[PDB]
Amino acid sequence: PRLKVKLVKSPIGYPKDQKAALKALGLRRLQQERVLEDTPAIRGNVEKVAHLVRVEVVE
Amino acid sequence: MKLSDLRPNPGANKRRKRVGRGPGSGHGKTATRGHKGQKSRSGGLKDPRRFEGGRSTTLMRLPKRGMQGQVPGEIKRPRYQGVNLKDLARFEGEVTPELLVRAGLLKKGYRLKILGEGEAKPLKVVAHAFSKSALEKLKAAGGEPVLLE
Amino acid sequence: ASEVRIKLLLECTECKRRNYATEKNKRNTPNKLELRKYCPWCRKHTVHREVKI
Amino acid sequence: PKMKTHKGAKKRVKITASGKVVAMKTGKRHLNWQKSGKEIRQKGRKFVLAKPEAERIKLLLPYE
RNA sequence: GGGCCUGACUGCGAGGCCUGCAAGCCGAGCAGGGGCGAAAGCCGGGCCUAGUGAACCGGUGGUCCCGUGUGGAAGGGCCAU
RNA sequence: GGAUGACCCCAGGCGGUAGGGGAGCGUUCCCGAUGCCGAUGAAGGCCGACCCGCGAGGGCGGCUGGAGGUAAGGGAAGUGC
RNA sequence: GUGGAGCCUGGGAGUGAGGGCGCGAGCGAUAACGUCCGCGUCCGAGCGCGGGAACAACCGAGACCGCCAGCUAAGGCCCCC
RNA sequence: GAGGGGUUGUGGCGUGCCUAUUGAAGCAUGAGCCGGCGACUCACGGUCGUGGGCGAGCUUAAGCCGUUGAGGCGGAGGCGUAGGGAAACCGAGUCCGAACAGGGCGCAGCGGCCGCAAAGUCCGCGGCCGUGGACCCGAAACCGGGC
RNA sequence: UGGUUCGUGGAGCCAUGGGGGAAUCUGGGCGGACCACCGCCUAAGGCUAAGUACUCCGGGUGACCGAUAGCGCACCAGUAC
RNA sequence: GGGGGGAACCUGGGGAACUGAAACAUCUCAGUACCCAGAGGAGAGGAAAGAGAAAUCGACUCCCUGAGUAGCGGCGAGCGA
Ligand SMILES: [Mg+2]
Ligand SMILES: [Mg+2]
Ligand SMILES: [Mg+2]
Ligand SMILES: [Mg+2]
Ligand SMILES: [Mg+2]
Ligand SMILES: [Mg+2]
Ligand SMILES: [Mg+2]
Ligand SMILES: [Mg+2]
Ligand SMILES: [Mg+2]
Ligand SMILES: [Mg+2]
Ligand SMILES: [Mg+2]
Ligand SMILES: [Mg+2]
Ligand SMILES: [Mg+2]
Ligand SMILES: [Mg+2]
Ligand SMILES: [Mg+2]
Numbered sequence A: 001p002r003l004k005v006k007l008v009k010s011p012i013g014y015p016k017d018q019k020a021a022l023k024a025l026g027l028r029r030l031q032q033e034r035v036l037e038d039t040p041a042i043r044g045n046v047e048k049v050a051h052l053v054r055v056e057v058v059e
Numbered sequence B: 001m002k003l004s005d006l007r008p009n010p011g012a013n014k015r016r017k018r019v020g021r022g023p024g025s026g027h028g029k030t031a032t033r034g035h036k037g038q039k040s041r042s043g044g045l046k047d048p049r050r051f052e053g054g055r056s057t058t059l060m061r062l063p064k065r066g067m068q069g070q071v072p073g074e075i076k077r078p079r080y081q082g083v084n085l086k087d088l089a090r091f092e093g094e095v096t097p098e099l100l101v102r103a104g105l106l107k108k109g110y111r112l113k114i115l116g117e118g119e120a121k122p123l124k125v126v127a128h129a130f131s132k133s134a135l136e137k138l139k140a141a142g143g144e145p146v147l148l149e
Numbered sequence C: 001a002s003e004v005r006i007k008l009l010l011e012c013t014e015c016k017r018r019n020y021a022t023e024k025n026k027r028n029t030p031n032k033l034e035l036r037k038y039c040p041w042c043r044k045h046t047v048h049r050e051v052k053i
Numbered sequence D: 001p002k003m004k005t006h007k008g009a010k011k012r013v014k015i016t017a018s019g020k021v022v023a024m025k026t027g028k029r030h031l032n033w034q035k036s037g038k039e040i041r042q043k044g045r046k047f048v049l050a051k052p053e054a055e056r057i058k059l060l061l062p063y064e
Numbered sequence E: 001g002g003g004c005c006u007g008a009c010u011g012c013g014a015g016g017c018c019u020g021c022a023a024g025c026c027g028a029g030c031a032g033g034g035g036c037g038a039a040a041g042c043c044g045g046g047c048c049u050a051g052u053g054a055a056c057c058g059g060u061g062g063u064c065c066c067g068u069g070u071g072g073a074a075g076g077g078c079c080a081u
Numbered sequence F: 001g002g003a004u005g006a007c008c009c010c011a012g013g014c015g016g017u018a019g020g021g022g023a024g025c026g027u028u029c030c031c032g033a034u035g036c037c038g039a040u041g042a043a044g045g046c047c048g049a050c051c052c053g054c055g056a057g058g059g060c061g062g063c064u065g066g067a068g069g070u071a072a073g074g075g076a077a078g079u080g081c
Numbered sequence G: 001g002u003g004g005a006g007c008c009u010g011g012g013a014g015u016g017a018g019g020g021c022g023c024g025a026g027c028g029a030u031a032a033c034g035u036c037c038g039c040g041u042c043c044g045a046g047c048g049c050g051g052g053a054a055c056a057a058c059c060g061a062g063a064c065c066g067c068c069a070g071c072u073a074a075g076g077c078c079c080c081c
Numbered sequence H: 001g002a003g004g005g006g007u008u009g010u011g012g013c014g015u016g017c018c019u020a021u022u023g024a025a026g027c028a029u030g031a032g033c034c035g036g037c038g039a040c041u042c043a044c045g046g047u048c049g050u051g052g053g054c055g056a057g058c059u060u061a062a063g064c065c066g067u068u069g070a071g072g073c074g075g076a077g078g079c080g081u082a083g084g085g086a087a088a089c090c091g092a093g094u095c096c097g098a099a100c101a102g103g104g105c106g107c108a109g110c111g112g113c114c115g116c117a118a119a120g121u122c123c124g125c126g127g128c129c130g131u132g133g134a135c136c137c138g139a140a141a142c143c144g145g146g147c
Numbered sequence I: 001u002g003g004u005u006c007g008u009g010g011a012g013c014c015a016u017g018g019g020g021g022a023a024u025c026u027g028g029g030c031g032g033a034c035c036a037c038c039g040c041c042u043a044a045g046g047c048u049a050a051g052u053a054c055u056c057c058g059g060g061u062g063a064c065c066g067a068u069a070g071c072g073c074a075c076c077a078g079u080a081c
Numbered sequence J: 001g002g003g004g005g006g007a008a009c010c011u012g013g014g015g016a017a018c019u020g021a022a023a024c025a026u027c028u029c030a031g032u033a034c035c036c037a038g039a040g041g042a043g044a045g046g047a048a049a050g051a052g053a054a055a056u057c058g059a060c061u062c063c064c065u066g067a068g069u070a071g072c073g074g075c076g077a078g079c080g081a
C-alpha cells in the first residue's frame, strides 16, 4: 500500500531529530501532504513524528 | 417444498421452434426457408463464413503475413507469462511462480514475469523476469525482486 | 512500361541499398540514371544510380 | 466433431483485443515501380476489416 | 522559353471523397535530409479525369528477426522490387 | 388509477405472401404415483341443438366399450397431414 | 413534427423471376398485354369490400369481431337494379 | 319442447383446394375416396441470447469410490486474469520510425469494511451457424465384389 | 516409393523394390538437410499376460416399440412368392 | 499336425468410386467400401539402435488431456500428429 502523510502540528519546540524526520519525509510546510511509500524506513520516521503528522493509508 | 413446487424460473426452459407444422404456426409449408433455391434445400448452402458465390473470397484476397512455421514445427523456447503487481496484492511474504499457478494467475509451463500494472507491496517476489517499471516499483515499495533462471 | 521503357531501381552509391523504383525510356536515356535521392540508411541525400530491376 | 480453425484466416488475419479483425492492406505484393511512396507506405500498414467481413472471419477462428 | 535542379522524397498523416466488400481518390500539417527562391513560399512527378490486375506460388536486393539439444548452416520471416 | 395482472377507465393500433417475434392447444413418455380415478365401468368408439375457451381444444351428458386411466405442477420428444 | 418515427449494438430472416398503370426518356415502327431505365403508384402480399356488364394492378377505399342502425366515396337514381 | 333441430321453395350473393407464378376458377401441377405411415433431428463444436452457480477467477476430463435410478472423489487440463509485434522482444503498453513526431492496435462499477451489481466462467434452455445423410422423397450415373 | 502432420518441401526419422556395400564398442543408429560440440540409444532373432475391441450366445435394465410400430419374421420367415 | 466354419471385433496382403474441392487433374472421400489370407476369445503391440531438450523420461496397449495445438495443404477444399 501507500501513505499520505500530512503535517498538522508544527515541529517548532520538538527535538532536532523529530525535525530531521520531517526533512527525511519531505515535509516542510504545515498541512503539506506527501503520498509516500509504505516501507519500514519511511514508516519509522512517520511513527517518530506521529504527533505532528496525520497519516492516510491510500493504496 | 415438494416435487410439484419444483419449477424453473420463467424463461429458463424455453420451448422449441417447430416448423413445417401447419398454417397457424407461422412456420407451415416452407418451414421458414423461403421458396426455392440452394438455401431451401436439405443440405443448404456452402459455408457462409467463407464461400461468396464463386468470386475470390474476401478472406482469400487478403495477403498472408508473418512466419507460419516449418516442419518439425514449433521451436521449443522459454515462454513468459506476465503477471501485474496488482495481482500480487493478495499475497503475503513470499510469492514464487508455484504460488501464482495455484492462485490461478500464472499458467503451468510458463516462466514468470512481473509487469508493473498496479501498486507494489513489500513482498518477496521470485520471478524469471521483471519489467522496467515493475522492478522500479517493487524496489521503491520495500520489495525483494528475486531474479530466477 | 514496355521493352523500351524499362522499370529500374535506384541504388544509393554509398551504402549500395536499392531505395527507389522508377522507370525510364532506355532509347531516350541509354546511360544509367544518376539522381540524388535521400537514402534512409545513410539518412542523407546521395548519388543514387540506376541498377537492374 | 469440434470445429477446425481455418488456417488461411489464421495466416492472414489477427483478432485484436476488442474483437476487431486486422489484416494487411492489399495491393503492394508486386507491380510497385509506378506506385507513389504514399501508396507503398500506406499499403504497408494494417487495416481493420469491414464489420460484416470481420464477423465472418472471426467465426473461422473459434479458438483464438 | 530559360537558369538552377531530382520532392518522379524517407518516416508519417489530421481530415475527408467514394463505397456492399476489397478497392479507388484528395490531403493540410509534423520530422529527416534536400531543391528552387532575396523572400513570401513552392516541391511527396506530370492541367485533370484512362494507360490496369486481389491473393497464392516463386525470383532478386536489403535486413540480421526465427534457426527444431547447443554454436553454425539449411530454410523461413520482415523491408524493397 | 391501485400499486407491481388484482381488475377498471380513457385513447390508439389490429388487410397481409416470404419472413421475424410472442402466447397457447393437443399427442407419446418420465417425476408427482407403494398415490389417485376405475366394473356403481378405464381407454377407445358413436352422438349432443349443453358448458368453458378467440382458437387449437377442454368439460359435461347419453349410447357403445369391457380394463385400464392418470391431476395440480414440472421434465423429455419418433408430437399434430 | 412523439411517429409500428429515428439512431446505436446484437440475434433471426426472407428477397435478389416482378407485373400493370401515370409521367420522363432510350430501343421498337411517334407497333406490341413489346422491351430497357428513371419518378410515382398500385397488384404482388389487399384474387377482401364498392364502381367499372363480367376483369390482379382504372376510379372509390386500407377488411379486429357483431348489429334486420346512420352518413358518405366512386358510380349511379326508366325497368333488369 | 316467444326456443331449437332437420329439410329446401323462392330471392340476394358467390370463379374448388394445393402448388407454381408477374398473374390461375382457370383449359397450368397434384389429388378417385377413406384410414393408417409420412419430412427441420441428434452428436460434437461455434455464436448469440436467456435461467441459475460462482467470480479474478470459473470449471473439471478420463478415471476412482460409493449407490444399484445416491452421490461423491478426481485440478490432469480448459477458458479468463494483457497487450502489441512477422518475430527477437518489450510490456500498460507495444508496433512502425532516427523521433522524446504522428499514427495503428491496446490500457481505467453501485450504495451505508459490508452488502448490490459485475469481468469472466460453469451448467441448463432457446435461436442460428459448422461437421456429419442434417428437412423428407427422387435421378440419370460412378465404383467394388459377385451372378 | 510408402508410412508419419509432413502433398519434394531446408525432408530428417521409420519401412523397402533396385544398385553399391561395411564394421563388432575406439563398434554403430538417433536428436528434422548438413558440420562440429553435447547427449540419447544399441539395428538387422524370437516370445510375452493384464488394461483395449466385438456381441452369434445368457442375463439384467429402459422418460425404448407396441402388430403399417418394434428385427425382414410376435404367427410353421429368410417361408410363400 | 493341417484342411473347414464362426455375428461383429482384430492383424496382415491388396484396394475403389460416387462425393468434396460449388467445374477439375494434385488434393478429398480413404487406406474407407470391398476382395483375400490369417488369428483368436480376443487380435495387434510390447521390454528402446525409443522419446527429445526436461541436465528429463523409461516396454506395450487403452481412455482422458495436450489439441483442432504443432504443422500439413492446387497454403484451396480441407488434412491433422
Ligand atoms: Mg507543535
Ligand atoms: Mg511548542
Ligand atoms: Mg536520535
Ligand atoms: Mg426442451
Ligand atoms: Mg432444437
Ligand atoms: Mg416461440
Ligand atoms: Mg409443438
Ligand atoms: Mg399450425
Ligand atoms: Mg414464430
Ligand atoms: Mg408468415
Ligand atoms: Mg402447402
Ligand atoms: Mg428463416
Ligand atoms: Mg428459424
Ligand atoms: Mg431458414
Ligand atoms: Mg418463388
Ligand SMILES: [Mg+2]
Pocket (backbone or CB within 6 Å): B034, B035, B036
Ligand atoms: Mg424466393
Ligand SMILES: [Mg+2]
Pocket (backbone or CB within 6 Å): B035
Ligand atoms: Mg415449394
Ligand SMILES: [Mg+2]
Pocket (backbone or CB within 6 Å): B035, B036
Ligand atoms: Mg425463385
Ligand SMILES: [Mg+2]
Pocket (backbone or CB within 6 Å): B036, B037, B038
Ligand atoms: Mg431454385
Ligand SMILES: [Mg+2]
Pocket (backbone or CB within 6 Å): B033, B034, B035, B036, B037, B038, B039, B040
Ligand atoms: Mg431462398
Ligand SMILES: [Mg+2]
Pocket (backbone or CB within 6 Å): B042
Ligand atoms: Mg437429401
Ligand SMILES: [Mg+2]
Pocket (backbone or CB within 6 Å): B041, B042, B043, B044, B045
Ligand atoms: Mg446441397
Ligand SMILES: [Mg+2]
Pocket (backbone or CB within 6 Å): B054, B055
Ligand atoms: Mg471467376
Ligand SMILES: [Mg+2]
Pocket (backbone or CB within 6 Å): B067, B068, B069
Ligand atoms: Mg505458429
Ligand SMILES: [Mg+2]
Pocket (backbone or CB within 6 Å): B072
Ligand atoms: Mg517428429
Ligand SMILES: [Mg+2]
Pocket (backbone or CB within 6 Å): B122, B123, B124, B142, B143, B144
Ligand atoms: Mg522483504
Ligand SMILES: [Mg+2]
Pocket (backbone or CB within 6 Å): D007, D008, D009, D011, J075
Ligand atoms: Mg492459408
Ligand SMILES: [Mg+2]
Pocket (backbone or CB within 6 Å): B063, D024, D025, D026, D027, D028, D029
Ligand atoms: Mg500486399
Ligand SMILES: [Mg+2]
Pocket (backbone or CB within 6 Å): D028, D029, D030
Ligand atoms: Mg513483397
Ligand SMILES: [Mg+2]
Pocket (backbone or CB within 6 Å): none
Ligand atoms: Mg516477395
Ligand SMILES: [Mg+2]
Pocket (backbone or CB within 6 Å): D034
Ligand atoms: Mg505514374
